[PDB]
Design a protein around this ligand. Structure first.
Ligand SMILES: NC(=O)c1ccc[n+]([C@@H]2O[C@H](COP(=O)([O-])OP(=O)(O)OC[C@H]3O[C@@H](n4cnc5c(N)ncnc54)[C@H](OP(=O)(O)O)[C@@H]3O)[C@@H](O)[C@H]2O)c1
Ligand SMILES: NC(=O)[C@@H]1C[C@]2(NC(=O)NC2=O)c2cc(F)ccc2O1
Length: 320
């Protein structure tokens, strides 16, 4: 396929570039999936909360499997367990719904989307009349053991974590019979995650960078905050290498051996996003991109300012 891979501790090879699907709407996502698969993507990043798994499933049924264009075994599919589904009794039903929507037998990777839980039910964002969330106190260690039962059932090959801090990861590892294979977190030159990455490396977790292009797609942008794709150093390197700024951002990550899942529905961008394995940055150029680190996080749960979940005791970002 188009991308090089990293070996997870499970023995699975995970492509260093995957297709992100948040905000890829029903009515466009089937085309994005089909285009990406045809040009050599072998890694898709999904989530129940994105509201598009049913359509992704139609794309997969037509394109992936026996007698189809892509063998199932060559495809890496990630999905994620949503916050309202942390209770042990809800974990299997949640995965089974995802598998039915995606029209798959099994997932290659299943992540706990966030370390904290929302009230059980069929409202993905259960809330009060003030707009604040109704939380649930199910601990992630309890959810983890429920997730482990899914591996024993042959429904998921590997488990992982999304938006966990180093302390929370260590906490999961203290009870894990099945070790998490992957940590998925926001990561790009403004939020380099150097220490967290080193932490994962020590414990055998590979890291996937979400929002690796700075999620210019996002609906709550501070006009005052810098745009990653517009960073002068990035644009300078883009000119030098005859590449797009997005390719610079992506190259930086895959050169660090960090998995990236850029989202696009634009065929030309989908193609360029995976073409990041034919050039290399010098040690000085890597240092220049490394210097951009500024502890600037773009992806934070917000309400009607203001951080929505930032006051929760199990909020992952409050640690350094
Ligand atoms: N685990 C989590 O809590 C979590 C959180 C956030 C994201 N994610 C995952 O990570 C994925 C990526 O993050 P993201 O979607 O927030 O943002 P992103 O991939 O950093 O950026 C997406 C935006 O960049 C544009 N784009 C894509 N390729 C481009 C290119 N080559 N040149 C210029 N613009 C380009 C896209 O526009 P077009 O589509 O119109 O081309 C879209 O507006 C998500 O889709 C999701 O799968 C996970
Ligand atoms: N702002 C945030 O931190 C998160 C991000 C997030 N996108 C994502 O891929 N995982 C997320 O949880 C998201 C996705 C949704 F479908 C709705 C809201 C939402 O908010």
């Amino acid at each position: 396929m188009a991308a090089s891979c990293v070996l997870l501790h499970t023995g699975q090879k995970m492509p260093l570039i995957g297709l992100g699907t948040w905000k890829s709407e029903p009515g466009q996502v089937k085309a994005a999936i089909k285009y990406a698969l045809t040009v050599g993507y072998r890694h898709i990043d999904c989530a129940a909360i994105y509201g598009n798994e049913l359509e992704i499933g139609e794309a997969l049924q037509e394109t992936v499997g026996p007698g189809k264009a892509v063998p199932r075994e060559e495809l890496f599919v990630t999905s994620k367990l949503w916050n309202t589904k942390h209770h042990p009794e809800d974990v299997e039903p949640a995965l089974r719904k995802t598998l039915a929507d995606l029209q798959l037998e099994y997932l290659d990777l299943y992540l706990m989307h966030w370390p904290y839980a929302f009230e059980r039910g069929d409202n993905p964002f259960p809330k009060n009349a003030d707009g604040t969330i109704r939380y649930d106190a199910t601990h992630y260690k309890d959810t983890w053991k429920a997730l482990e039962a899914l591996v024993a059932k042959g429904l998921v090959r590997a488990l992982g974590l999304s938006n966990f801090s180093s302390r929370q990861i260590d906490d999961v590892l203290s009870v894990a019979s099945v070790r998490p294979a992957v940590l998925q977190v926001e990561c790009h030159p403004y939020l380099a995650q150097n220490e967290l990455i080193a932490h994962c490396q020590a414990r055998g977790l590979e890291v996937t960078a979400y929002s690796p292009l700075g999620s210019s797609d996002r609906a709550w942008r501070d006009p005052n905050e810098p745009v990653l794709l517009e960073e002068p150093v990035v644009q300078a390197l883009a000119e030098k290498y005859n590449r797009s700024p997005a390719q610079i951002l992506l190259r930086w990550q895959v050169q660090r051996k960090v998995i990236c899942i850029p989202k696009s529905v634009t065929p030309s961008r989908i193609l360029q996003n995976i073409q990041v394995f034919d050039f290399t940055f010098s040690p000085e150029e890597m240092k220049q991109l490394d210097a951009l680190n500024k502890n600037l996080r773009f992806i934070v749960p917000m309400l009607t300012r203001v951080p929505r979940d930032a006051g929760h005791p199990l909020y992952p970002f409050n640690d350094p």
